[PDB]
Amino acid sequence: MTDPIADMLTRVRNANMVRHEKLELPASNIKKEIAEILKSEGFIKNVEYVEDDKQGVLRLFLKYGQNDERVITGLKRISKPGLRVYAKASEMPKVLNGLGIALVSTSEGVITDKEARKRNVGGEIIAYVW
Amino acid sequence: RFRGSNWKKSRRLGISLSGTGKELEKRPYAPGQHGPNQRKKLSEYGLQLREKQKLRYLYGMTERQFRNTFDIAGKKFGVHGENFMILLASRLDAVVYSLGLARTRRQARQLVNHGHILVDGKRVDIPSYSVKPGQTISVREKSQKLNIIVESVEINNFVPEYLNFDADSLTGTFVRLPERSELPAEINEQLIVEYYSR
Amino acid sequence: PTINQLVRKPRQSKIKKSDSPALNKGFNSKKKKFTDLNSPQKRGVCTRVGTMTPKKPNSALRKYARVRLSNNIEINAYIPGIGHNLQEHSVVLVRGGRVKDLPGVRYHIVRGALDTSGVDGRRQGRSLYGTKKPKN
Amino acid sequence: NDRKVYVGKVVSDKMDKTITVLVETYKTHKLYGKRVKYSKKYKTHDENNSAKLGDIVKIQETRPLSATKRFRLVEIVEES
Amino acid sequence: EFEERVVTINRVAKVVKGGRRFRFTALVVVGDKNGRVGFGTGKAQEVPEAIKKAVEAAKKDLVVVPRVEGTTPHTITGRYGSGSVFMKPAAPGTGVIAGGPVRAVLELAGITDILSKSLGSNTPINMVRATIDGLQNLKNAEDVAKLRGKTVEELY
Amino acid sequence: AVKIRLTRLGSKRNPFYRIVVADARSPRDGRIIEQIGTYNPTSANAPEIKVDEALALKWLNDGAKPTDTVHNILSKEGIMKKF
């Protein structure tokens, strides 16, 4: 339980393998950031925040689209305690030529892969969710 | 230039590709050692080496001496495939090779033996030059032209763009390096300079 | 594929050994120990002629050469071609490595090479087992 | 061009100020990239004071004025 | 028309109660120069019209390259077993790089402009699969945003 | 002790040179820190005398004087005789 989000990350794609949703998951202050900034793009049925203390409970409720097909086709974290890879906000890579998105913490608040390119802010840029 | 004898080369290359030829005073089908037999089939490497059969006889575009501007301007503009076919005939030995003053294929390179010496530059009795924007093979230093080169002032007119013969020099060099159209017909691009890089 | 113990403990490469280990070498007498050289060119001076019979894959007959290199060791050769140099005691230009189908021999002869010229029954080869001044 | 505030901790000591301070830093190798932390030992000195059993301090790079020792600085954290 | 280039010409026999029976294993590439190619299981003992024997039954299985303008919009190194290929966008005149009969599913697609290499395998029974999966993971310029849930111009 | 030096990479076809402040006990070739440029003493390549000797003409009161027959280049100038 040392990474409070770790498996939970790909549990999106390892829960919606056949587009399925029966998986309730635990919280963070970034499990108040992991599932809250891609609803910016209509990606979740509901994660509004975690409503408990002690980093509790949360319905994952992963929105699925109109072609029936994996909203999250595949997904990896490349940022875990035990894998610390820190880069700048300039050559943040091209996430499938920009087809994917990133949602991550920065060195000046909280941003996305829509901010690093136009704000020069960020630290351990995390993943490629698609 | 020649390096041997040629005119059996109807079925070796296509043809020298910028004249009339010496092809068919005979059966021009069988290329070699096939006289009572079928044709030659297709490949890519059989294709590739057919390409360079029609490169090393077409011009004196000898290997280990010509690909070089292809890789040289591989830092300059465009996928260098047709750049090459316009990088092997954008010389004053080509802006004056279609100029029609030769009767041997070697006489567009030998247009200047004692023909066209000083094209705004120093007397150079050679095949080739460095044919930059507006670069000719122009009038001779202490002469103008000879009776083996000026004997064909416009021996065939309509000689290509950037070979616009303002005559008694027998060459035209209008603008720049040449758009590779007015040169071999059945040739390709990814089978001229996309066969060489491997 | 985990990188902690990777600077704690490293990995290897493959495992290969180069070609002709008792070759590319010139044996000392002053300081008694060999030279790791990989020289382009070298000599061969003869001790016997040599021939073994049992040949399966070809199943014709042809001999080879037993030429000793420097200063007391077994060095063995073969003459790949249709030319028989019924000779010995020569001083030559070595060819390094083995041709197909002879184990343990890695030392050969260039055409000409200061000892003889070659099997003079060749005139079309113009580049095999002795062939100089050949009309092209 | 001034002189740094090198710091550290202490391990042991011998008769009449054979003093020392620990040295360490954040950095990595060029090959297989892990955040493994690393150290090397130094040579400061006092009358007898900066010494074992708790001397979290600073050190210097100056004229040593010393045998093969090198430092004159002690800028502390605390004691035990 | 399909440029009906022979893919691969393979021999097996079946050992029997007598003299074993040979055959010739083959197919044909069926290339619109738009991105798809299918296959016909012309299981037989004839070499030249196995090409035709695949032109017969090919159209059961052809799948689309969701073409971008002489290119592909996103980058791929997939494989459905072993044979893998790497694909990217590129400037529309690039030089063409390819391996086997995937000179008939890269040079015969709505791209032609790549840096495409076959990562690892490059055989008559892996190049296809390699490129097949490469092309099965694609998408047009207006549809990620819906299984996503926005408009696509909401990524940059 | 200071003397003039020059650079070397690949051309001539006209007597060329360079301006620098190397050591005295050494050859024509020398190391240059503050590259001032080069010099063309071929009386033909006028577009090559872009030498901006700013630390080479500051040896006037530091330690310098025309030597080794190089006063011809300093003959056209006159940033000396300040003492």
Add this chain to the structure above:
RNA sequence: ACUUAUAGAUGGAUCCGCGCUGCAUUAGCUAGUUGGUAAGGUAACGGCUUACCAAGGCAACGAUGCAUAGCCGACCUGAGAGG
């Protein structure tokens, strides 16, 4: 055209730093290991020989031994890390 109170300078450098490779068939650690304390002196602090005393200073992390022992604009070269 001599000798001096004085100089800009020359190789350097008194020296600081990262420059500064391999052998685990070499850890219970060298008596100076820890560093303070000398008459001394090199344009140069000071275990640098000596000056006074206590080592566990080490400590299973390479103490130490230890084998080629120049480096650095060069060259073939990668897409790039550079190698």
Add this chain to the structure above:
RNA sequence: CUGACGGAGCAACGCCGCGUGAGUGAUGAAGGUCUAUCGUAAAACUCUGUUAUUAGGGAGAACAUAUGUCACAUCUUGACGUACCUAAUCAGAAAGCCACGGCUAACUACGUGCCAGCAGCCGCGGUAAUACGUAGGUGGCAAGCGUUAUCCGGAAUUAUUGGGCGUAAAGCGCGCGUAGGCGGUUUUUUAAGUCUGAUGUGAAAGCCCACGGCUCAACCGUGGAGGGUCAUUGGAAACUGGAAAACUUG
């Protein structure tokens, strides 16, 4: 004084500057693998100076107490000091190519009856070597033929970018288990660092570039790319980081 630096038999060692045949030619013969092939082979006519009979050969460039009063200078700088050598110019040949099928790119066969023997991984002669002995050449070539062996992208057979676990060539005798790689939730006291940066903006011949002198190639140069936290330490506490606790069901 050079023996520092210079003047060179030049090794076809580097590769180039280009020169040793022309206007060529009706298919053209006396035909050399095959039995129409390289034959548009040939001849005998003409074209270039550029190799060769000579010649004058002065390419660079500025040297110097007394000359009169460190800016500096004349009555003071041709061994190679002859080059660019147009130069009329005859015809002053550019050795010879490999395997000789198909891949490494190649063309067929008499010799050859397993006697010699072909063979860059694949691979060939026992009575048609579309391999060999040899013979006219098409794919590359003309200062070039087969070989000599070194790391490069290729070798993705290092895995810094680009490493398997049951199975190639691979998983714990495990109760045990120091160092430490990793090492709960939330706020965190940190104000170091990353966000990145004001600055220092200290030179480069050339840099991520290009170009100009040069019979173009051997031999030189503008440096706008600041010289790579270098001469100042930062503001974002979202945190590996001087580190106060609380949560508990794990």
